[PDB]
Design a protein around this ligand. Structure first.
Ligand code: ATP
Ligand code: ADP
Ligand code: MG
Ligand code: MG
Lengths: 188, 47, 469, 508
């Protein structure tokens, strides 16, 4: 078989297999950015209430669905890769999980351009200077060229401190966990 | 479903043990008698 | 080639290859293990993944661990240097004595001999056991089975055979312990060292051992039989010589195959067995054969789960054997040891044109009298012995004498009985049973015949019983 | 949901328009391979049960045609097949060579010689999956198929075009019945009567190679290979070969049937073909039924056994007797495959282990044995003696319980016991020593007229032998008269009376 080039992050499931096929197809011929843009476009194109209502009805024949999607793709001047992907999803009847495929490819492309999602949780909000030093130190965690994608949620359930997720790495300087630790060890 | 020879002692219920004992007691008795006769013959054939 | 673990479920590991896949049955080596873990490819799942069974514990495996592809099936060391040693499934030594230094490595998977290689000659193999020699005589180059449940004498009988045949056998010998207690493996190692078949000093060892005991994961138990079979095959072909091959039990091969089938995605068959039971057993039992280039005498112990001879595993194994000796628990309860069932054992050579008309007629007379005894036992359960026709009591007496006379003391069962082992030449067994049937002993008591060798020993025991009466 | 062809490799191919350079009509790429089942992508123009050929020289049969893929069963070890291989159509359903060029040759399930005696003649080929005849071509079973065994020919007659069934336990004598039947046909094949010659086919499914080699040696010893084919599908063979071998044998026999000759095919053992089919079905993920057997396992054996017919003179008059062998486990004729094949066939020769060791070998258990064809498949002389023998044996079987007591019972019961014991000792037979029909009828005639009520039962087996040798040597004219004539004429009856009395007059 053709030795497909594996994606950076392995997505699994039906969407995973379709997205890995698309990523392998695009990586050769080097059309990853354009194909991602076209995927974002079809993200809205199919979402149109008329098109969505006409594609979620399993009593319109697959022939009609494929013909309509071919017409839309021609009317949008897409890459042959994206047009063939939409045709393939339509033939296999996998349109109901098309947004899953776009989301999978988005996740797969983000890692391709070197991004490590991050999460910070605190009892209350932060002052922008402190967030700046957080940016600096977290970038210290990352490797060379690995952009960061910070997300700062606010969880009052914890009693203070901070919680940081960087990929699968996790550091919990939160008051609640330390209270729990002392209460347990002291209880013993 | 059929029946075969030597099945009463294959089940091993009450009849199986009863039959085993009815056999063993009789043959212990006969073995005792035969051993007595063997001793008598031994003694009578020394000369 | 280099691949990458992508799943670990029990003993089944899924390995993904970016380059070309490895063929089925190839051995792969996991990189990053203190010991040697070898996986064997069993399926291609598509998307470059291959499913495999691990020949060792899959603890501490990490999704992503690199794997090397050896390019060939598991290759074990073979030759005269393996004699006196012990081995795993993967051939590395487990006797703590150093590397096995051979020039030949043999893959454990091979095609069975073709039909144009079969030997069609049979001649009795005299083992020195009365019941075996009389009713189910063995044959040189033939495959022997020892069926029976747990605790009936399979291991004792096989040890007894090693004591007799292997000790006085010019050719080599192989013992593959498949999924049996490790205590027994150590006991055999030390008993062989004591006897002298395994010599730790010189290079005069006559036995090569392979052990896959029941602490191993199913992958290793399913393949240690093939490892022992490969050693035996080499000694058959290249050495061009007679070989013995003892296996204990060859039911653990089937069972170990059944412990991974469900995880390989196969629907089960009749009783929680893999769908490939008969094919998997045939592709192994068909390499244990006496071709025209050599000759393997194969003795196999076959566990019969819950004494059920109609279970799929023993039922299928029956068709691959020339001689069978179905040890029976109902006879071991009576104290008749070995508990070989005279009516449920058979041999191929048991024909008047191979053994002789005297041997054949004696055997058939014994079997007929025992069957008549079984028929009578139903009546005795109602009438009683006192009410039988004076001819029937004669049948019962002869049947009980013959039942006891088949018992024999082994040289390896000294510990249990405390008696001394006896080897009975074939002519003496034939004479003894012919006389017992002819009525030349219808005065000696039954117990005189219990656990003795030739018939004269029964006469002497009866004399002693009478004197101290 | 999910499909097996939705793997990312196929989708990758199809996204960048690389699916047009690959011919997906007559070639395919293996998606999966495991436990002897390959799942192939493509082969869109492949017929059900067609034979495909893998790139590595192996063959396979395409059984499961699903929307996504084709399920091929490989004819050998799947060691050589790897995911991504190339599978090409052969174009033709599986067929085997046929003709008199196979006689005396050992072949495997596909007609390849395995005895190393050279290529196989093979002028004609025949498809193994051919529909059996219909209602009209057949005609009632009338001719006898001389088994050479006293019990089978006397109390369980087998005609030509009949499907008997040698059902029994393990190590009871089934293969011995088959081999004696095969060996007894030499007296007809050697002769010149062209409507009595029977050609034999022995299908050996799932037996080890040593057994088949010994069997071939046994046939060669008896000079009974020159008219025998042996089709081996031994244990080491892949499941599809064990599954096909009965059909290859049946087609090699249908050749003889279609051309006016007569054939005997002995599917030994069918309970192993059922197991091989069960394997193939379970690995193809087909829905299991009772005991894990697929649903269409009755179909598998019925479409095989219903090809044993007796064509009429407007089609040639040939015939194909079938003698399927089945191994019941304990005594269970109510299991699945024993039930199916007992309901398919026309009779059964039921063998025992109680009888085997009681000294009654062959262990044919009459009373459980039956032949729904019956007297129609017997000669007139055999009818004459066997009617009385069967009646007397039936009388003896319902008072056999008293056999132990015997005495202290009326005279009628004593006579029944005595006659029954003599008759049972008469039906005993050696091994590989079949008997011509004249010999059998002479022996049974002596037995059933009371001429052995004086001899002790232990001496009946010696009488039978000595008397038979006597008549065979001194009196050939009477035996020839009975044989050619087919009946016992009054003068022949008187001659038999005088011969039996004169020999028995002094026997000692
Ligand atoms: N009529 C007979 N007289 C003497 N011996 C017999 C007779 N029939 C069978 N035997 C012996 O019984 C043994 C078993 O017979 P055979 O193998 O034909 O039965 P089987 O059911 O085919 O065995 P399996 O089914 O296990 O292959 C053979 O060794 C054969 O020689
Ligand atoms: N020849 C014999 N004489 C006396 N006892 C025996 C003999 N063989 C086996 N036994 C009994 O059986 C036990 C060993 O059984 P073994 O053969 O090891 O089990 P298995 O056959 O299930 O592997 C011993 O404890 C012993 O009491
Ligand atoms: Mg044991
Ligand atoms: Mg047989």
């Amino acid at each position: 078989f053709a030795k497909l080039v594996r994606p950076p992050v392995q997505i699994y499931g039906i969407e995973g297999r379709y997205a890995t096929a698309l990523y392998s197809a695009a990586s050769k011929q080097n059309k990853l950015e354009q194909v991602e843009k076209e995927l974002l476009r079809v993200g809205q194109i199919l979402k149109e209430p008329k098109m969505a209502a006409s594609l979620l009805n399993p009593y319109v024949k697959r022939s009609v669905k494929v013909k309509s999607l071919s017409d839309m793709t021609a009317k949008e001047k897409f890459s042959p890769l994206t047009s063939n992907l939409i045709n393939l999803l339509a033939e296999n009847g996998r349109l109901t999980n098309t947004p899953a495929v776009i989301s999978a490819f988005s996740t797969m492309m983000s890692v391709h351009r070197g991004e490590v999602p991050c999460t910070v949780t605190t009892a209350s909000a932060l002052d922008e200077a402190t967030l700046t030093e957080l940016k600096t130190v977290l970038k210290s965690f990352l490797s060379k060229g690995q952009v960061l994608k910070l997300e700062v949620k606010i969880d009052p359930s914890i009693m203070g401190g901070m919680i940081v997720r960087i990929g699968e790495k996790y550091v919990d300087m939160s008051a609640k966990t330390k209270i729990q630790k002392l209460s347990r060890a002291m209880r013993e | 479903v059929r029946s075969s020879a030597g099945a009463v002692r294959d089940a091993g219920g009450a009849f199986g043990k009863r039959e085993q004992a009815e056999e063993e007691r009789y043959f212990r008795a006969r073995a005792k008698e035969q051993l007595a006769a063997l001793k008598k013959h031994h003694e009578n054939e020394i000369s | 080639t280099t691949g990458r673990i992508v799943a670990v479920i029990g003993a089944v590991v899924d390995v993904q290859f970016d380059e070309g896949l490895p063929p089925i049955l190839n051995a792969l080596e996991v990189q990053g293990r203190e010991t040697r873990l070898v996986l064997e490819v069993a399926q291609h799942l598509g998307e470059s993944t291959v499913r495999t069974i691990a020949m060792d514990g899959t603890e501490g495996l990490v999704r992503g661990q690199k794997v090397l592809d050896s390019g060939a099936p598991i290759r074990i060391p073979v030759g005269p240097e393996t004699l006196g040693r012990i081995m795993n499934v993967i051939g590395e030594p487990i006797d703590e004595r150093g590397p096995i230094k051979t020039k030949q490595f043999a893959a454990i998977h091979a095609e069975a001999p073709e039909f144009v290689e079969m030997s069609v000659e049979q001649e009795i193999l005299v083992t020195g056991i009365k019941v075996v020699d009389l009713l189910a005589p063995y044959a040189k180059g033939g495959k022997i089975g020892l069926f029976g449940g747990a605790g009936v004498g399979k291991t004792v009988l096989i040890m007894e055979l090693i004591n007799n045949v292997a000790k006085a056998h010019g050719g080599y010998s192989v013992f593959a312990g498949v999924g049996e207690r490790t205590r027994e493996g150590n006991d055999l190692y030390h008993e062989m060292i004591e006897s002298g078949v395994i010599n730790l000093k010189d290079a005069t060892s006559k036995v090569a051992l392979v052990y896959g005991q029941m602490n191993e994961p199913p992958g290793a138990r399913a393949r240690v039989a093939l490892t022992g079979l490969t050693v035996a095959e080499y000694f058959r072909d290249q050495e061009g010589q007679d070989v013995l091959l003892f296996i204990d039990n060859i039911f653990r091969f089937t069972q170990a195959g059944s412990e991974v089938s469900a995880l390989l995605g196969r629907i089960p068959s009749a009783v929680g067995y893999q769908p490939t039971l008969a094919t998997d057993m045939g592709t192994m039992q068909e390499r244990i054969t006496t071709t025209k280039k050599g000759s393997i005498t194969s003795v196999q112990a076959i566990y019969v789960p819950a004494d059920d001879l109609t279970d799929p595993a023993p039922a299928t194994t029956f068709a691959h054997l020339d001689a069978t000796t179905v040890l029976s628990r109902a006879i071991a309860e009576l104290g008749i040891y070995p508990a070989v069932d005279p009516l449920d054992s058979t041999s191929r050579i048991m024909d008047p044109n191979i053994v002789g008309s005297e041997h054949y007629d004696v055997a058939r007379g014994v079997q007929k009298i025992l069957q008549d005894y079984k028929s009578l036992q139903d009546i005795i359960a109602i009438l009683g012995m006192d009410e039988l026709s004076e001819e029937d009591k004669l049948t019962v007496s002869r049947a009980r004498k013959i039942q006891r006379f088949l018992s024999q003391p082994f040289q390896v069962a000294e510990v249990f009985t405390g008696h001394l082992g006896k080897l009975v030449p074939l002519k003496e067994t034939i004479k003894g049973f012919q006389q017992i049937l002819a009525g030349e002993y219808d005065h000696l008591p039954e117990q005189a015949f219990y656990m003795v060798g030739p018939i004269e020993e029964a006469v002497a025991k009866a004399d002693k019983l009478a004197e101290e009466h | 949901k999910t499909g097996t062809a939705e793997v990312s490799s196929i989708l990758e191919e199809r996204i960048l328009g690389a699916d047009t350079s690959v011919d997906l009509e007559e070639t395919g790429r293996v998606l999966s391979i495991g436990d002897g089942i390959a799942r192939v992508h493509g082969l869109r123009n492949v017929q059900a049960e067609e034979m495909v050929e893998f790139s590595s020289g192996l063959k396979g049969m395409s059984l499961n045609l699903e929307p996504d893929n084709v399920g091929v069963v490989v004819f050998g070890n799947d060691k050589l097949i790897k995911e991504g291989d190339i599978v090409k159509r052969t174009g033709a359903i599986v067929d085997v060579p046929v003709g008199e060029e196979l006689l005396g040759r050992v072949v495997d399930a596909l007609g390849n010689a395995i005895d190393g005696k050279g290529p196989i003649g093979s002028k004609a080929r025949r498809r193994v999956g051919l529909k059996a005849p219909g209602i009209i071509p057949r005609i009632s079973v009338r001719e006898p198929m001389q088994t050479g065994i006293k019990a089978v020919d006397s109390l369980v007659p087998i005609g030509r075009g009949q499907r008997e069934l040698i059902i029994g336990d393990r190590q009871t004598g089934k293969t011995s019945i088959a081999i004696d039947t095969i060996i007894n046909q030499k007296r007809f094949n050697d002769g010149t009567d062209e409507k009595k010659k029977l050609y034999c086919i022995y299908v050996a499914i799932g037996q080890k190679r040593s057994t088949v080699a010994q069997l071939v040696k046994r046939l060669t010893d008896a000079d009974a290979m020159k008219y025998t084919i042996v089709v081996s599908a031994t244990a080491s063979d892949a499941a599809p070969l064990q599954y096909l071998a009965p059909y290859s044998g049946c087609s090699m026999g249908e050749y003889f049937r279609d051309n006016g000759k007569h054939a005997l095919i002995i599917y030994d053992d069918l309970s192993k073909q059922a197991v091989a089919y069960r394997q193939m079905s379970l690995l193809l993920r087909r829905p299991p039924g009772r005991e894990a057997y697929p649903g269409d396992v009755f179909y598998l054996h019925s479409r095989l056994l219903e090809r044993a017919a007796k064509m009429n003179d407007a089609f040639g008059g040939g015939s194909l007797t079938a003698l399927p062998v089945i191994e019941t486990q304990a005594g269970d004729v109510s299991a699945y495959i024993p039930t199916n094949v007992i309901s398919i066939t026309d009779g059964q020769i039921f063998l025992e282990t109680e009888l085997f060791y009681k000294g009654i070998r062959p262990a044919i258990n009459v009373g459980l044995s039956v032949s729904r064809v019956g007297s129609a498949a017997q000669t007139r002389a055999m009818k004459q003696v066997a009617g009385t023998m069967k009646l007397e044996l039936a009388q003896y079987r319902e008072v056999a319980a008293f056999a132990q007591f015997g005495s202290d019972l009326d005279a009628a019961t004593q006579q029944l016991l005595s006659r029954g014991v003599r008759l049972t000792e008469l039906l005993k037979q050696g091994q590989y020593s079949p008997m011509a029909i004249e010999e059998q009828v002479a022996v049974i005639y002596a037995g059933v007229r009371g001429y052995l009520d004086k001899l002790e039962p232990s001496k009946i087996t010696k009488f039978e032998n000595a008397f038979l040798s006597h008549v065979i040597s001194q009196h050939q004219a009477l035996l020839s008269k009975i044989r050619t004539d087919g009946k016992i004429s009054e003068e022949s009856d008187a001659k038999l009376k005088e011969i039996v009395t004169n020999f028995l007059a002094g026997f000692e």
